[PDB]
Amino acid sequence: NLDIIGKRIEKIKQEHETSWHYDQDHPYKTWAYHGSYETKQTASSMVNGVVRLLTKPWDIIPMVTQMAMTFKEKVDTRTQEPKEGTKKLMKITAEWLWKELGKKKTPRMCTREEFTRKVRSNAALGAIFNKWKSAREAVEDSGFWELVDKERNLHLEGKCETCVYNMMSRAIWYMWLGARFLEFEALGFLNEDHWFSRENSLSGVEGEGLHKLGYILRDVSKKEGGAMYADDTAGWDTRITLEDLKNEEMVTNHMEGEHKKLAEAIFKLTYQNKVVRVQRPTTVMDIISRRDQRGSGQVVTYGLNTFTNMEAQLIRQMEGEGVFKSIQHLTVTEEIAVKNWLVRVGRERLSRMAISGDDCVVKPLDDRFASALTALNDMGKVRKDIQQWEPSRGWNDWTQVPFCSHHFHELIMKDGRVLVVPCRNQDELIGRARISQGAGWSLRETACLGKSYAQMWSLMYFHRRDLRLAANAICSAVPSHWVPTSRTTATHEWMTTEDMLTVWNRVWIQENPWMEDKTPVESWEEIPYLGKREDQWCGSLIGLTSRATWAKNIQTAINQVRSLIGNEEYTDYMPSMKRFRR
Numbered sequence: 022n023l024d025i026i027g028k029r030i031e032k033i034k035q036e037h038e039t040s041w042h043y044d045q046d047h048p049y050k051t052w053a054y055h056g057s058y059e060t061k062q063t064a065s066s067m068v069n070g071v072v073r074l075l076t077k078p079w080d081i082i083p084m085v086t087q088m089a090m091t092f093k094e095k096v097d098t099r100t101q102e103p104k105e106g107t108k109k110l111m112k113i114t115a116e117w118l119w120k121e122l123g124k125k126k127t128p129r130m131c132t133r134e135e136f137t138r139k140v141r142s143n144a145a146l147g148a149i150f151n152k153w154k155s156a157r158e159a160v161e162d163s164g165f166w167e168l169v170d171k172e173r174n175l176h177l178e179g180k181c182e183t184c185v186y187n188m189m190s191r192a193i194w195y196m197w198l199g200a201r202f203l204e205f206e207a208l209g210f211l212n213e214d215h216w217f218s219r220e221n222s223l224s225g226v227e228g229e230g231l232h233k234l235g236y237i238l239r240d241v242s243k244k245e246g247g248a249m250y251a252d253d254t255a256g257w258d259t260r261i262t263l264e265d266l267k268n269e270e271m272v273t274n275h276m277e278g279e280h281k282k283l284a285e286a287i288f289k290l291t292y293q294n295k296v297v298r299v300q301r302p303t304t305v306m307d308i309i310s311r312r313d314q315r316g317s318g319q320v321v322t323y324g325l326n327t328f329t330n331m332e333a334q335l336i337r338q339m340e341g342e343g344v345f346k347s348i349q350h351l352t353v354t355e356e357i358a359v360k361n362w363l364v365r366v367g368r369e370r371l372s373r374m375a376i377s378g379d380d381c382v383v384k385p386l387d388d389r390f391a392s393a394l395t396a397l398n399d400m401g402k403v404r405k406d407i408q409q410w411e412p413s414r415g416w417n418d419w420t421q422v423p424f425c426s427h428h429f430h431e432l433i434m435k436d437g438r439v440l441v442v443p444c445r446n447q448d449e450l451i452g453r454a455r456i457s458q459g460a461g462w463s464l465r466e467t468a469c470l471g472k473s474y475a476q477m478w479s480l481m482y483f484h485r486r487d488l489r490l491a492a493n494a495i496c497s498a499v500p501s502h503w504v505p506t507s508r509t510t511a512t513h514e515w516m517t518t519e520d521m522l523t524v525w526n527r528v529w530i531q532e533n534p535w536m537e538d539k540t541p542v543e544s545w546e547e548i549p550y551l552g553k554r555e556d557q558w559c560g561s562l563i564g565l566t567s568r569a570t571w572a573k574n575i576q577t578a579i580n581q582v583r584s585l586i587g588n589e590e591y592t593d594y595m596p597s598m599k600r601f602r603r
């Protein structure tokens with residue numbers, strides 16, 4: 022309690038000393054309360070007019086249009102302590118997993134220089150507005166780094182003053198850029214040096230890209246075993262136990278010198294003890310603490326989520342295989358059986374999984390996995406939309422498994438080569454491309470965001486008739502040389518001014534390890550679509566009157582957007598499609 026968080030609390034107390042009141046009508050049951058103080062403020066979703074003008078048929082589809090319009094009672098729940106058998110399974114598994122992840126990697130500190138390059142090329146690092154405007158300005162000023170230095174030396178002393186979370190099934194915990202630096206310095210190596218790559222972790226997919234995930238799931242499907250399981254956890258971040266946070270900290274056992282002490286302090290002072298500020302309407306700022314749950318930077322959150330998910334799923338596999346009999350207590354010889362399973366088959370069992378933070382697919386040895394629920398439930402990783410003790414539904418076909426919000430099709434080219442392509446309901450793809458975040462967008466910046474979605478569709482979703490047509494229309498309506506942009510950046514090969522056919526060939530043919538024949542494709546007409554009925558099943562409007570009129574009259578829509586943008590240099594991309602080619 023207060024010896025580790027007090028200083029941070031003490032400090033905030035004084036910045037609002039003409040406001041501090043121990044409110045008595047405070048809602049928190051599971052968050053420890055400390056006090057309140059005066060504040061007054063809230064960024065909703067804006068429409069991208071370039072994408073909307075070129076997707077007119079979707080103006081009357083509520084699944085698209087409702088996406089642009091508009092539980093914090095899950096953060097305020099608690100998770101019971103796991104039993105001694107569960108705690109032992111996790112500690113053995115975590116010890117073993119860090120060693121395996123560390124065999125071909127060296128933990129190291131990330132640098133001011135690396136941090137500065139990050140901010141000067143924009144990533145969602147989750148900082149705040151104060152003393153400096155943007156992140157870009159604070160990183161150039163030496164005052165900031167003196168602030169960073171004071172905290173840095175405070176952390177080496179086992180103490181914390183300024184590392185405080187700000188809240189805003191989603192809950193995002195912003196910190197000041199300084200606290201974000203110190204987290205990146207100590208733990209950025211997990212992401213920067215690709216600890217969760219598939220090559221390094223066997224279960225992981227970090228840095229893969231949507232064009233690889235289907236091939237990875239098809240490779241898991243080739244293993245002998247049972248159904249493919251893809252259980253979602255109900256609110257994963259809220260189910261992270263203090264025992265989980267202590268198993269994650271064991272990465273520090275692999276460190277040395279300064280780095281070890283700096284990493285130990287992030288885990289002790291900011292992860293295993295937290296201070297948060299929350300906006301209440303009744304409008305005060307509440308200063309609450311708790312020891313458990315996930316509240317880190319989103320990039321460190323991804324790697325530690327992947328780690329603890331890999332651990333949980335290996336333990337569920339051990340349970341299905343009868344490695345241990347009960348979670349109440351491991352015998353002395355059960356401990357040696359678990360250790361020996363890990364050493365003997367651990368790497369094979371990791372290769373049976375695809376894990377992306379809280380998202381997993383597992384192809385276990387057999388279907389005993391389906392009813393192996395005691396460890397999973399007792400670790401607190403309770404499955405979503407199924408009754409606590411009901412067996413998991415198994416998927417018989419890798420093409421029907423959900424993963425990273427997608428499913429995957431096998432698509433055969435006219436020349437016999439096999440593509441495994443990513444897919445999701447087309448209403449979701451169109452509805453997302455019609456949304457922008459934040460204020461002060463010029464027409465040119467709105468156009469370049471539309472172009473980013475269009476190029477993503479040409480590379481990932483070329484097999485959907487409506488998206489290849491709409492992508493060609495947007496790229497025809499935006500000036501040819503204008504550069505695609507985003508405000509929150511997986512691999513993003515569509516973010517380029519290179520010819521999209523050249524990028525398609527590099528991604529799907531040249532650099533694709535599942536494609537033996539490297540013959541380049543010479544035109545978009547060589548590049549296939551889903552079957553017409555499969556395209557409709559996944560949300561295509563082909564066969565509707567609205568869609569036929571849109572496709573026939575597309576040059577009129579393109580010219581409407583060109584007239585709004587004005588006299589600029591444009592290319593007509595529609596003749597790359599058979600139907601507009603004379």
Ligand SMILES: Fc1ccc(NC2CCOCC2)nc1
Pocket residue numbers: 486553554563564
């Ligand atoms: F590009 C296309 C693709 C399909 C289509 N219509 C067909 C959809 C399936 O039932 C027969 C008609 N029109 C244009």
Ligand SMILES: [Zn+2]
Pocket residue numbers: 172176180181182183184290
């Ligand atoms: Zn601190």
Ligand SMILES: [Zn+2]
Pocket residue numbers: 428430444445559
């Ligand atoms: Zn599909």
